[PDB]
Amino acid sequence: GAMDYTLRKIKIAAAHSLSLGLLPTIVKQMPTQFTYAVEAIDVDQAVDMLREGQSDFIFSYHDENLQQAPFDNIRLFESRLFPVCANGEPRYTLEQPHFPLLNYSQNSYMGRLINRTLTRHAELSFSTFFVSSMSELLKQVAMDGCGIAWLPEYAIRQEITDGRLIVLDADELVIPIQAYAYRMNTRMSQVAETFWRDLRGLQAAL
Amino acid sequence: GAMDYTLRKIKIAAAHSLSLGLLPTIVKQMPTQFTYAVEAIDVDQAVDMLREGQSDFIFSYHDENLQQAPFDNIRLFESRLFPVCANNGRGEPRYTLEQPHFPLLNYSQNSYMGRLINRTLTRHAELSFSTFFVSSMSELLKQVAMDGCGIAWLPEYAIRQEITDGRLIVLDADELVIPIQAYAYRMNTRMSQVAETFWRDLRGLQAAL
Lengths: 206, 209
Ligand SMILES: [Br-]
Ligand SMILES: [Br-]
Ligand SMILES: [Br-]
Ligand SMILES: [Br-]
Known about the structure:
Chain A is α/β, with parallel strands linked by helices. Chain A contains six helices and nine strands; from the N terminus they run βαβαβββαβαβαββα.
């Protein structure tokens, strides 16, 4: 495993689309008995980094391989993806032939879902204009009026109520997402167990 | 990857501490005849992703390996890293650099920002700190700093409004200010017509970013 070891350091590897939105909440509401080392990763890197010992815990989404036996998990929260765009009416329409699309990477948990829904809807012709795994990068480019992006509710909650971003669909084009915290089912240090035990108690407040 | 291709796609790999602040102004000012594919990387991945067909351009800082042939470069902008922290509700810093083992919010050891900060901290033996939060995402250290968790060295372009608002307070404006310089790197060989257009077009914006 990793030779890097302290008694209080919590080594976390979080998905690109999840780090900025979730980790500030955890670090703030956790008992200050920990030291944090955060590494932004893709979803497909999480399995090896847990088995190799690179990370004590993983903050990503629904992973088919991580839900199973050698790993334990907590569902941190579930959210919904809403296709939004900038300016009190949408700057773009979904029925517009080949609209500018702001999407996540193909190898992200979240780009795969949007790519599946778009292919499932033949009535939506689009032109991919910007691709990034950072939810904030896609958010800022969307607020600049560059196109349409599927974004999570928590990351654009203030902009939807503000009017800077406008939701385009609430029924058939809403994609569900579930965020999870993963770990090896084996016993860890006493502080890592304290981190895991506390993390469960903060879940209802997440 | 090397096989993925469209007519207008421009594959970009930007450093973790630079991708979010640099990409929006580039997309907004570049003539929108381009398709963007951006992925955040660590500084040490730039050479291999350029030699292979993984990235057309790299958005990083001063890296000596990338400042020689077979690479061409272009200067984008320079900035400064200020040690900042949240306020204590009275317009004064919640922490001070003189605190024995003050909470430090630092970049990762593998980042170019982390090495510059660690060197600055090593040069000043009068500062005792305790590493509390580590991440090479500038805006993650930024919000953790705004929540009042410790002191972080952050670039001026990412905390400009927070300095004005007072949510963040600069702790040193002299010896602890670290100069940084962003670059855009590329292979010296001839690229596609669309890629060469991107390179020249970005060159015309290197003083307006
Ligand atoms: Br994702
Ligand atoms: Br404990
Ligand atoms: Br230059
Ligand atoms: Br860096």
